[PDB]
Design a protein around this nucleic acid. Sequence first.
RNA 1: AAA
Lengths: 293, 285
Amino acid sequence: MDVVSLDKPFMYFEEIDNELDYEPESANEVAKKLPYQGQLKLLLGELFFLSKLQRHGILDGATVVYIGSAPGTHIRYLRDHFYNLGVIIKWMLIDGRHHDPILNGLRDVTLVTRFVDEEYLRSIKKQLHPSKIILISDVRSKRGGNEPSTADLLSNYALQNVMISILNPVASSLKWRCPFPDQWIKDFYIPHGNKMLQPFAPSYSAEMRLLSIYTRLTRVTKSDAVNYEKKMYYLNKIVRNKVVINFDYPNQEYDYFHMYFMLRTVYCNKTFPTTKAKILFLQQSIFRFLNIP
Amino acid sequence: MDVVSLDKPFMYFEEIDNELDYEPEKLPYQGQLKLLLGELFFLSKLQRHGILDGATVVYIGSAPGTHIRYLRDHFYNLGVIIKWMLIDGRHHDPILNGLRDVTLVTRFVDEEYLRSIKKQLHPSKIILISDVRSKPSTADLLSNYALQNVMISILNPVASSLKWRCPFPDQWIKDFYIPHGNKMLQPFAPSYSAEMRLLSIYTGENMRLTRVTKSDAVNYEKKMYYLNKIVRNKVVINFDYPNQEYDYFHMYFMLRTVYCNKTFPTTKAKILFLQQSIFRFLNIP
RNA sequence: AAA
Ligand SMILES: C[n+]1cn([C@@H]2O[C@H](COP(=O)(O)OP(=O)(O)OP(=O)(O)OC[C@H]3O[C@@H](n4cnc5c(=O)[nH]c(N)nc54)[C@H](O)[C@@H]3O)[C@@H](O)[C@H]2O)c2nc(N)[nH]c(=O)c21
Ligand SMILES: Nc1ncnc2c1ncn2[C@@H]1O[C@H](CSCC[C@H](N)C(=O)O)[C@@H](O)[C@H]1O
Ligand SMILES: Nc1ncnc2c1ncn2[C@@H]1O[C@H](CSCC[C@H](N)C(=O)O)[C@@H](O)[C@H]1O
């Protein structure tokens, strides 16, 4: 790995300052180096999103509606974290697949086995209104093959718009991965929001998280798709294979450097002599729960 | 506006008997009124031919679909059994919620999705209604007309109603094929819209494609401009009705083909109740 | 996402 000095990592997509032509050979590298790296990827991004809402004082008293939550192993850590902080949250996890049994026996966590559609979204809105809803969507459908088709993505993203216009959440975190330019079909629309980059995403994933706080929609064109492809490939090929030699941490690889800056936003009841001691404690706690050495 | 004197309105595109060269260029909820009338006319025709009862209406491009609630109630109250499948990429009007015979689907439709819903709707007879459109470039239209064609060839419906608006010749690209059918003109369409509804009834799996040429695009633009500038701005004075503007005269003759359980003294009385009913549902004072 |  190449060495580099950095004052900060790229937190949002628009900070990526270079592009590189996608090489299809990338699909052969190991996608997830760490065990349960997907749960880790989700835990860090959702801890980041929710801690920002806690910062703005809108998290306390809210109901987090998480659609596409199964198996959701990491959600148990997320829930325990805010419960131990004394934040009053109710959890509603909805997925057609069964959830991880580690989520059982929690009074503030309602498990629902169902694929959501427009009719069902209206019923849970009427049930939860007038309480604050925070939406987390990680839905993904697939029709055969080995990867989702562009039609599957367009249907998923249309559904995520339906979630927003019906649930009317105070804030939302949406799965966002643009269709690749060679599989384009039609322009489509997604909400406004910040495009949070994900440490410990798959090695060459172009997925990010669309974070919005609500106080319209934007068109996505094929030229945007080309831009996403080249920017994320530079990020995955070059940036995430750097060692940050000025970074004071046991692991200096970029993804740990990136994770570090996200964990700095997290609240904690325990006091620490240094910020590093806090982050190191949080990281080992996350890794231990997820069975990562 | 201008005073007129007619015996019947222009019901289909072929009846337009004059052209006119183009030039650059509205009730509340007129778009829902336009769709309601055209679909009530199409489905009533199917009721007369006895192929409506027991069918599934596959409506692609249905949102928001406010007027569909009126159609569903109209035929339901008559004892006609219709199942409704409304498929779109955005959500529908809440007035469609809570109806067990109406299924709301959020999906971007492609060929493979059509095949799967064909399998799951079997053995029901299918009635297709398509109003798909993207937020128009000629290429967008050709894309939608290509999709509407595979809707028919895959779903094998007993009848279909297709959105049909020819690309303008100053935006022509290449010839394309559309199904054979009757080109129904729509009252209360936009003042200078060239859009009509293509209505087809199939038997023996006889589907026939017809070429659309650049010369056709000119003949559409000319005939529709004569209809939009001349025919529709007239006032049929020999028409016994509270409103004699040509659109209501057009609508009057469409609503006359609509069944109703209530008896009436005059046929005028029946159409006046239907129009008042349709306006009162759509909140059109 | 997990394997
Ligand atoms: C008649 N004419 C107009 N222009 C000019 O060219 C353009 C065509 O507009 P137009 O209104 O004629 O287009 P349409 O597709 O019919 O309607 P349109 O309003 O485009 O589409 C309406 C439909 O869109 C759909 N729709 C409505 N809202 C939405 C939405 O939010 N999303 C999506 N996806 N579809 C929507 C729905 O199906 C609705 O009925 C305009 O600039 C005209 O002035 C002409 N130009 C030339 N050279 N020659 C002509 O003869 C001519
Ligand atoms: N319409 C729908 N409603 C709810 N969940 C859906 C859905 N379509 C797809 N999904 C779910 O989307 C998920 C994508 S993977 C989600 C992983 C999950 N966030 C975790 O923490 O492990 C799948 O579990 C799938 O069942
Ligand atoms: N491939 C596709 N799959 C599903 N819906 C589509 C589509 N392409 C376009 N549409 C839908 O086509 C619609 C055109 S407007 C339709 C209005 C509707 N007939 C009503 O009664 O209100 C849009 O809502 C759009 O989302």
